[PDB]
Amino acid sequence: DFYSLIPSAPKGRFDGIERAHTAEDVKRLRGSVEIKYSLAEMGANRLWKLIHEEDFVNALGALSGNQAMQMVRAGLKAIYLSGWQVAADANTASAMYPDQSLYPANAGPELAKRINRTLQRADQIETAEGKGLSVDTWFAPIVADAEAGFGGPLDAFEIMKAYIEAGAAGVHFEDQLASGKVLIPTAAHIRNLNAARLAADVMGTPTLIVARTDAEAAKLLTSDIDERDQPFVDYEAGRTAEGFYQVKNGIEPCIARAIAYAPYCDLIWMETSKPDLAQARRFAEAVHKAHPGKLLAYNCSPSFNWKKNLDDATIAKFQRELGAMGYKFQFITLAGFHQLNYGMFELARGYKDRQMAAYSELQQAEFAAEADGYTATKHQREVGTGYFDAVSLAITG
Amino acid sequence: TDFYSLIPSAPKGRFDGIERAHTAEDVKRLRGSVEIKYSLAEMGANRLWKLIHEEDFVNALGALSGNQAMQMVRAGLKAIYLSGWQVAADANTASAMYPDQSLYPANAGPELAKRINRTLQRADQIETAEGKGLSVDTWFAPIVADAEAGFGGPLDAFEIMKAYIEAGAAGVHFEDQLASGKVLIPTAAHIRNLNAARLAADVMGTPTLIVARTDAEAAKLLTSDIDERDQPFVDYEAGRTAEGFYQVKNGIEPCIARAIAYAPYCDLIWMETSKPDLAQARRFAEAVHKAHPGKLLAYNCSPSFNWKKNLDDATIAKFQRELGAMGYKFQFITLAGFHQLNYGMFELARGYKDRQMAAYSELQQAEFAAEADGYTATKHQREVGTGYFDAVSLAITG
Amino acid sequence: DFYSLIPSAPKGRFDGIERAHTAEDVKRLRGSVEIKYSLAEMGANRLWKLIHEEDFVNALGALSGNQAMQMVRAGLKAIYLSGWQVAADANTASAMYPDQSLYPANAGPELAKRINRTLQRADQIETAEGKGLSVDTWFAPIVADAEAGFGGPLDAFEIMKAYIEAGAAGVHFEDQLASGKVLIPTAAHIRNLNAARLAADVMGTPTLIVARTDAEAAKLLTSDIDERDQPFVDYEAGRTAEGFYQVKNGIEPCIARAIAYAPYCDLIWMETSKPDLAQARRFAEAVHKAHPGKLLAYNCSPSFNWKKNLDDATIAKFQRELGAMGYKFQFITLAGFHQLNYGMFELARGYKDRQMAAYSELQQAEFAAEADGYTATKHQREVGTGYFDAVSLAIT
Amino acid sequence: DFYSLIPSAPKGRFDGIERAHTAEDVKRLRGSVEIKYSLAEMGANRLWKLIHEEDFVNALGALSGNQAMQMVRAGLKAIYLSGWQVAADANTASAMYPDQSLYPANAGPELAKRINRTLQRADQIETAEGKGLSVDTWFAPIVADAEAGFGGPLDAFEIMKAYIEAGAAGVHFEDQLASGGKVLIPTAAHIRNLNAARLAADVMGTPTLIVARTDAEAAKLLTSDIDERDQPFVDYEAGRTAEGFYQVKNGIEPCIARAIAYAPYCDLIWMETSKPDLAQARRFAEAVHKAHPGKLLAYNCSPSFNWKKNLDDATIAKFQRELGAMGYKFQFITLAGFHQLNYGMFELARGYKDRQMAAYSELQQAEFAAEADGYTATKHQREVGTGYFDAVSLAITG
């Protein structure tokens, strides 16, 4: 009956998915006209295929259309769009921000739109050349950061709709207040999740919803109104000057919240500062007890000192291991940011020292990378000169 | 001293050898009734003027983003280049990937300048809040920005110049091609564009630098033969193309002719070159200097030129200092940010596909290694201003 | 063939239309994936329907989504989007501009997008209330100004696509180099028209193309290269100081240009600052001689002093008469600008004079208009408060 | 020491104003470089002058630069910028919204910039014509809606800085969680927001006015009872709702309490009200002045309130004049632009559907008739800068 309102949804896309609202609600609220969202449709269905067919899907956080394109060119199957990086350097306020939802709510979707436009141009370049594609598809699904929705359920409703028009495949939402960390009631985050599903239903796309819990670390809670949160409340503490409740953090409230969110999302993600295969299994097992086979997601922290804290062999198997535990979507949130910043610092350092010699090093690196499939050395082609040549050529009589 | 009167922040000798088509009285008519200050435009302009009259040369890289620009300034570079090609490539207001014509909206350039300056501003705020002084000479390295052909006629050039000033660009370049090989405009048409940009600078009250660029080295076409200075270069024996364009002889001769013609009307002169040649650069420099002695010159180091194959390590190594000695005081690699961004992500992504976390660890380790040489972005919260905003939060709560 | 590549095109949509490019050219340049553009299809098809079935379609230039919404609510069947107004009060440089394509080239499509979102919201409000729509449709087709395409053929390609993505139904292109008026060669404007058509084909939508000529008043021409323009050049004069050619303006070059442009557009428009049924007739009849039944468009000048220059009977019948001659799309370009500025000047004048009394005058006027279909007095409902109440209720 | 940080602040600007942060906090937090913000300086200072000099300063909600232009032209001395209107027809999400802080934080400052740019042009036009200005100043002060600050103190800190860069003169902040009816935040949470605003203005080094708004009149909910200043109004019998909100008693009493609490932390106080009543405004005015004598107040004249039905024409006629005597110095109609725009276009469109060119001719004759009262928009292309840009062209060419 919902499969009817969402034409492109594959069979059993909504297995085990509960909704607060009805099919009649969707029809009341969708408008009288059918508008299509092709990339959102394709991306979401490709993401659904991938997470069920692959060992696991790993992604990196892209700061620009160009970064995303290179990711896809290199053979990655999905793209991650990070809020931290949006705040850092890809931003509608045009400012550098800390990760606190400081930028305007339209900034994520705007990046997703940019990414898709670069992928579209890459697709057009190769299609015009007529030798076939050099990747499986240029439209690798985008999974994107919606933060806490930027307000209440309607803000989450709006931010979901915007990601859909931009052409994102999946979108994640977290149970912190945004402003260390402060949690909102379980009930409250289920409200946001439901808004996001309603938005998707209303757009007629089977967009993926990721639920994120920030309960591992958060020692604060807005309100004890929800009976499910009360076991973690240190009532004897008691409230803070801001009126927040003091809370018991760790894996146990993460498990309880994940279990509560499971019917309302397509993947579950426990935010973790400290990568640990044993904790990962712990969490996975607990969740699978109450919801067997539930798709899980995992952030591989960019600030964790990988080599210091784990042996090389464990680093090498980390993602393979996570996948076999049921973490089907894995990503490094700040990969683009680190890569961009490091690369240019080293380019700019050597250019101060030895000028044109520094750049020659870069160029020779690029040339060597061609055998591996790097093409951006042919920079005019990369950007679509030969594509617009052909356009000019077709226009002429 | 009437133009010095109107641009308060101009240093002594700023407008020496510079001719204007308008009067100071024209400025006062077109200025509005209210003085509006553009601090970053002033500061960038005066710091750029100073640097090009003191360093043996100022070199710059083309920055695709604010973070890229920051690392440039942190690394010790003194100026930032903002490339039109790169804007079209990965940073425009149509959110599209474009080839290098002028397909993107005219505001795209000035919007990047503003982005770049806002990043620098934040890096400055962070270090100022830490209270131990700056790790750089200044976070606000002057920005020299591509305006293409001005996006139409002299009024479009007027407008983009103003937009760049409000964004806090220090210098802006203008080229004598149509945008539609390359098709030049008449010499006089391009002088009109440069005058538009100076009237814009004068109306805003800023000593903003104006770079004139000539595309005559490679261009075989010219819109109109109306200008008697361009007439010698026309092959009237062709005669005109289906589009009505005139065939023209390219090379160094027309670059010299135009450059000398453009000289009284700009601050720096630039000949677009595809094949870097110290001898051909010496030619152009000398020829221009006979007509205009000590004239500031700019030079583009082609990113596509295969440096290793065409030159020797010694020639490559000396290349930039060689040009500085000739009088090429501003040198830049246009597409450096593009090549770095793209190469870096392809290699990381390739490695991450092959061996997942092992590939990230390698990048991470390289970052740690780089901290000795002055890299700080490994402390990612700090780079981005959370320590600054922590301080902001404390101050509000007493 | 081309109907295969533009799936929503009605039959005979491209009767009489020529193209420089092949169906094969489209396949190569459109990419490997099928991306749909619902609003652009629906707009294009409704407009095509309207201009063939109504006596004439008339429209006013909208400056904002609200303005557009009131047009549709009042019962107008199409919306005009004016470049002059974009320059004036609604561009992406956030500045007030004269009409010389000074603003960034994304500004028009950006407005088109605003208008379509407002109309979408208006449609959601009524759909959620569940009592049917108060209009035939909220998605009145938008005809939009692409100016001179903002450069060359590739610039025109780009702006056409952007308008299609925005949901525009038709787009107009003019043979001037705004960059008084200076014309481009006949063949150069044909190149622009062709680029716009390839953009439509590549996007897979049957978007309407209007060819505008500025030849009535223009006395300058970039180049005499095109033999079709040479009969109008005044070679004695000869060239101006910036290298332009001097041209005999008037209806004759308009006719020649219209006739040459005709196979490459869906509507032809002769730009005029002086509204005149006799001239409108001469143009139409000459064009139909070479191209029977060719759809035409007419701008009804806002600057022209209607009352002083024409009698009331003519003013009253003007659009009706134009319709009968074959002018099936008619608009007033700056209608929104004039309404907006007059309305606020007068409100602000009373408010300075007698404060709250003046607003009450406005408020009462609004209540009176409720009989004719005005709803914005219930301002909360108008903006979507009831729609979002229902959304909230659904979530909980 | 604070006056030293705000160079343009007139003497006695911050009398009776308290701050949580120190002058040293400001110095640490403002970066190492002085950036000026001229329109924000002029606008604030001018606003400050008008509210102390005029009997009262009234304003209308502008939806666009052109609307603001006509207000100034018609003789109005300030401009109000409505958050509701931004949600309606002028935001950066390019969508129509109810006002529940749904549009991106971006949008208000963007409108403020649009308006100031329109006014500059209007000023440029008249200055170029060299016959004096037809107004006291084209740069009428803008007072703008920041809503609930779009989050916490840092969001409020940021939107304040964005409004300053855009050149707003004053900025209001409300004690609701726009994010049953309205929901209030604790008294302490709002004072936090107001302080972040003051800090922002201080860090920018401008004397921007801060307006505190209370929504306690109609608000029947509160996020937390943590602040003992709010506990007198809690209905503890109720008790909490499913979102965990406390139920509260609304009206003039909590408005007075909150107003008094807010008074040291802002420049003007505004009690939001949906029922305009002179006696209640007298009530509120008196109560606040008892604790803070001669405190500047602001008043919103509800556009939704059916005025003619509910009051008599003499009361209507005198309403604003009476409030001004009570100490309501800044008064405004939030949605004036919206109602004018929508009414005008509906009626024009109605007439056009019925009688085509006859309807338009009627408008045009009205405009001609209005020329005697200072209306100039019939002159069409002058209004927009055609004459101005012709003069620029002339300076460049001939």
With CB atoms and an 8 Å threshold, state whether A28 touches C127.
yes
Helix (H, G, I), strand (E, B) or coil at A229: coil
Q: Name the class of domain C1-396.
A: alpha beta
Helix C277-290 with C251-261: angle, nearest 10 deg = 40
With CB atoms and an 8 Å threshold, state whether D339 touches C70.
no
Closest-CA distance, D192 to chain C, in angstroms, reads 30
DSSP A233: B
Distance of alpha carbon B81 from alpha carbon B74, whole angstroms: 15
Amino acid at B246: Y
- Consult the annotation and say whether C299 binds a ligand: yes
Asked if residues C91 and C340 have their Cβ atoms less than 8 Å apart, the reply is no
With CB atoms and an 8 Å threshold, state whether A139 touches C33.
yes
**Closest CA in chain D for residue A221:** D244
Q: Kindly state the tokens that stand for A355.
A: 């000028």
The count of CB pairs under 8 A between chains A and B is 278
Asked if residues D158 and A92 have their Cβ atoms less than 8 Å apart, the reply is no
Contacts with D126 from chain B: Cβ below 8 Å: 33
Q: What CATH number was assigned to the domain covering residues A1-397?
A: 3.20.20.60
Question: In chain D, after which residues is the C-to-N distance over 2.5 Å, breaking the chain?
Answer: 179
- Return the domain boundaries, chain C: 1-396
Closest-CA distance, C214 to chain A, in angstroms, reads 23
Distance of alpha carbon B112 from alpha carbon B116, whole angstroms: 6
Distance of alpha carbon B130 from alpha carbon D29, whole angstroms: 9
Asked if residues D129 and D66 have their Cβ atoms less than 8 Å apart, the reply is no
Header resolution in angstroms: 2.4
Q: For strands C170-174 and C142-145, give the pairing.
A: parallel
Contacts with B93 from chain C: Cβ below 8 Å: 92, 104, 106
Distance of alpha carbon A74 from alpha carbon D43, whole angstroms: 54
Secondary element (H or E) of residue C81: strand C79-81
- Give whole-number Cα distances, D269 to D159, D176, D266, D281, D296, in Å: 19, 15, 7, 12, 7
**Closest CA in chain C for residue D313:** C357
Is the backbone of residue A58 left (phi > 0), alpha (psi -120 to 50) or beta?
Answer: beta
What's CA C47's distance to the chain center, in Å?
Answer: 12
Query: How would you class A384 by CB atoms within 10 Å of its CB: exposed for 0-12, middle for 13-18, buried for 19 or more?
Result: buried
Distance of alpha carbon B267 from alpha carbon B296, whole angstroms: 7
Instruction: Give residues with Cβ within 8 angstroms of B293, minimum separation 6.
Output: none
Measuring CA to CA, which residue among B150, B141, B142 is closest to residue B84?
Answer: B150
Q: Kindly state the tokens that stand for A238.
A: 């008691």
Instruction: Give residues with Cβ within 8 angstroms of A290, minimum separation 6.
Output: A259, A262
Q: Kindly state the tokens that stand for A239.
A: 């409230």
* Beta-carbon-side half-sphere exposure of residue D201 (alpha carbons within 13 Å): 31
**What are the phi and psi torsion angles at D137 (to 5°)?**
-160, 140
H-type alpha helices, C182-334: 186-203, 251-261, 277-290, 306-309, 312-324
Distance of alpha carbon B371 from alpha carbon B354, whole angstroms: 27
Q: For strands A220-221 and B297-300, give the pairing.
A: unpaired
Q: Kindly state the tokens that stand for A191.
A: 């409200």
Query: How would you class B304 by CB atoms within 10 Å of its CB: exposed for 0-12, middle for 13-18, buried for 19 or more?
Result: middle
Q: For strands B246-247 and B221-222, give the pairing.
A: antiparallel
**What are the phi and psi torsion angles at D66 (to 5°)?**
-60, -40
**Closest CA in chain D for residue B195:** D396
Give the full edge-to-edge strand order of the sheet including C182-183: C182-183, C220-221, C245-246
Distance of alpha carbon C66 from alpha carbon D84, whole angstroms: 13
| Cβ neighbour number for residue D12 with a 10 Å cutoff | 9
Buried b (16+ CB within 10 A) or exposed e, B175-201: bbbbbbebbbbbbbbbbbbbbbbbbbb
Distance of alpha carbon C71 from alpha carbon C57, whole angstroms: 13
Q: Is residue C25 within 8 angstroms of chain A, CB to CB?
A: yes
With CB atoms and an 8 Å threshold, state whether A223 touches D242.
no
Secondary element (H or E) of residue C163: helix C153-166
Residues annotated in a binding site of B for Mg(2+) = 146
Distance of alpha carbon C244 from alpha carbon A387, whole angstroms: 33
Helix (H, G, I), strand (E, B) or coil at A96: coil
Asked if residues B16 and B295 have their Cβ atoms less than 8 Å apart, the reply is no
Q: For strands C170-174 and C208-213, give the pairing.
A: parallel
Contacts with B393 from chain D: Cβ below 8 Å: 153-154
With CB atoms and an 8 Å threshold, state whether A123 touches C39.
no
Bridge partners, A16 (sequence order): none
Distance of alpha carbon B301 from alpha carbon B274, whole angstroms: 8
- Consult the annotation and say whether C272 binds a ligand: no
**What are the phi and psi torsion angles at B319 (to 5°)?**
-45, -55
Q: Is residue B77 within 8 angstroms of chain A, CB to CB?
A: yes
Contacts with A185 from chain D: Cβ below 8 Å: 243-244
Virtual torsion, Cα A99, A103, A108, A110, nearest 10 deg? -150
Measuring CA to CA, which residue among D231, D271, D229, D227 is closest to residue D247?
Answer: D231
Bridge partners, C327 (sequence order): C296
Virtual torsion, Cα C174, C163, C116, D179, nearest 10 deg? -130
Distance of alpha carbon D175 from alpha carbon C62, whole angstroms: 37
Measuring CA to CA, which residue among B33, B41, B50, B54 is closest to residue B7?
Answer: B41
Amino acid at C335: A
- Give whole-number Cα distances, C141 to B211, C43, C45, C167, in Å: 46, 4, 9, 9
Measuring CA to CA, which residue among A135, A88, A387 is closest to residue B346?
Answer: A135
Measuring CA to CA, which residue among A125, A164, A129 is closest to residue A144?
Answer: A164
**Which CATH architecture describes the domain B1-398?**
Alpha-Beta Barrel (3.20)
Instruction: Give residues with Cβ within 8 angstroms of A336, minimum separation 6.
Output: A60, A61, A62, A63, A64, A67, A82, A85, B345
Instruction: Give residues with Cβ within 8 angstroms of C377, minimum separation 6.
Output: C363, C366, C367, C370
With CB atoms and an 8 Å threshold, state whether B189 touches C241.
no
Q: For strands A245-246 and A220-221, give the pairing.
A: antiparallel
Bridge partners, B332 (sequence order): B60, B300
Q: What share of chain C is helix, strand, coil (3-state, %, to 5)?
A: 50, 10, 40
Contacts with C29 from chain A: Cβ below 8 Å: 124, 127-128, 387, 390-391, 394
Question: In chain B, after which residues is the C-to-N distance over 2.5 Å, breaking the chain?
Answer: 180
H-type alpha helices, chain D: 2-5, 23-29, 38-53, 65-74, 83-89, 107-128, 153-166, 187-204, 252-262, 278-291, 307-310, 313-326, 336-355, 357-370, 386-396
DSSP A296: E
Distance of alpha carbon D281 from alpha carbon D258, whole angstroms: 15
State the sign of the Cα–Cα–Cα–Cα dihedral D7, D8, D11, D14.
negative
Query: How would you class D209 by CB atoms within 10 Å of its CB: exposed for 0-12, middle for 13-18, buried for 19 or more?
Result: buried
Distance of alpha carbon C42 from alpha carbon A32, whole angstroms: 13
Distance of alpha carbon C366 from alpha carbon C376, whole angstroms: 8
| Cβ neighbour number for residue D355 with a 10 Å cutoff | 15
State the sign of the Cα–Cα–Cα–Cα dihedral C102, C40, C66, D364.
positive
Distance of alpha carbon A71 from alpha carbon A373, whole angstroms: 12
What's CA A30's distance to the chain center, in Å?
Answer: 26
* Beta-carbon-side half-sphere exposure of residue D338 (alpha carbons within 13 Å): 27
- Give whole-number Cα distances, B54 to A95, B135, B327, B330, D240, in Å: 32, 21, 12, 12, 71
With CB atoms and an 8 Å threshold, state whether D106 touches A100.
no
Count of helix runs (H) and strand runs (E) in chain C: 15, 11
Distance of alpha carbon C246 from alpha carbon D131, whole angstroms: 36
Measuring CA to CA, which residue among D193, D175, A220 is closest to residue B397?
Answer: D193
DSSP C374: -
Which residue has tokens 């595309």?
B215
3-state secondary structure string across chain B: CHHHHHCCCCCCCCCCCCCCCCCHHHHHHHCCCCCCCCHHHHHHHHHHHHHHCCCCCEEEEECCCHHHHHHHHHCCCCEEEECHHHHHHHCCCCCCCCCCCCCCCCCHHHHHHHHHHHHHHHHHHHHHHCCCCCCCCCCCCCEEEECCCCCCCHHHHHHHHHHHHHHCCCEEEEECECCCCCEECCHHHHHHHHHHHHHHHHHHCCCCEEEEEECCCCCCEECCCCCCCCHHHECCCCCECCCCCEEECCCHHHHHHHHHHHHHHCCEEEECCCCCCHHHHHHHHHHHHHHCCCCCEEEECCCCCCHHHHCCHHHHHHHHHHHHHHCEEEEEECCHHHHHHHHHHHHHHHHHHHHCHHHHHHHHHHHHHHHHHCCCCCCHHHHHCHHHHHHHHHHHCC
H-type alpha helices, chain A: 2-5, 23-29, 38-53, 65-73, 83-89, 107-129, 153-166, 186-203, 251-261, 277-290, 306-309, 312-324, 335-354, 356-368, 379-383, 385-395
**Closest CA in chain D for residue A155:** D102
- Give whole-number Cα distances, C188 to A53, B289, C184, C263, in Å: 53, 41, 6, 15
DSSP D233: G
Instruction: Give residues with Cβ within 8 angstroms of C320, minimum separation 6.
Output: C55, C56, D356
Amino acid at A372: D
Interface test with A, best of B356, B367, B375 (most A CBs within 10 A): B356
Asked if residues B86 and B68 have their Cβ atoms less than 8 Å apart, the reply is no
Query: How would you class D264 by CB atoms within 10 Å of its CB: exposed for 0-12, middle for 13-18, buried for 19 or more?
Result: middle
Helix (H, G, I), strand (E, B) or coil at D6: coil
Buried b (16+ CB within 10 A) or exposed e, A323-358: bebbbbbbbbbbbbbbbbbbbbbbbbbbbeeebbbb
Q: Kindly state the tokens that stand for B118.
A: 């806002």
Secondary element (H or E) of residue C88: helix C83-89
Contacts with B192 from chain D: Cβ below 8 Å: 396-397
| Cβ neighbour number for residue B279 with a 10 Å cutoff | 6
Amino acid at A377: T
What experimental approach yielded this model?
Answer: X-ray
3-state secondary structure string across C35-77: CCCHHHHHHHHHHHHHHHHCCCEEEEECCCHHHHHHHHHCCCC
Distance of alpha carbon D125 from alpha carbon D376, whole angstroms: 12
What's CA C90's distance to the chain center, in Å?
Answer: 15
Helix (H, G, I), strand (E, B) or coil at D57: strand
Bridge partners, B33 (sequence order): none
Measuring CA to CA, which residue among D116, D126, D115, D248 is closest to residue D184?
Answer: D248
Among D154, D162, D226, beta carbon nearest to A239: D226
How many residues does this entry show for chain A? 397
Q: Is residue B186 within 8 angstroms of chain C, CB to CB?
A: yes
Distance of alpha carbon A322 from alpha carbon C10, whole angstroms: 54
Q: Is residue D386 within 8 angstroms of chain C, CB to CB?
A: yes
Measuring CA to CA, which residue among C315, C300, C293 is closest to residue C270?
Answer: C300
Distance of alpha carbon C68 from alpha carbon C61, whole angstroms: 8
Closest-CA distance, B186 to chain C, in angstroms, reads 9
What's CA B382's distance to the chain center, in Å?
Answer: 29
**What are the phi and psi torsion angles at D214 (to 5°)?**
-115, 135
Buried b (16+ CB within 10 A) or exposed e, D305-335: eebeeebeeeebebbbeebbebbbbbbbbbb
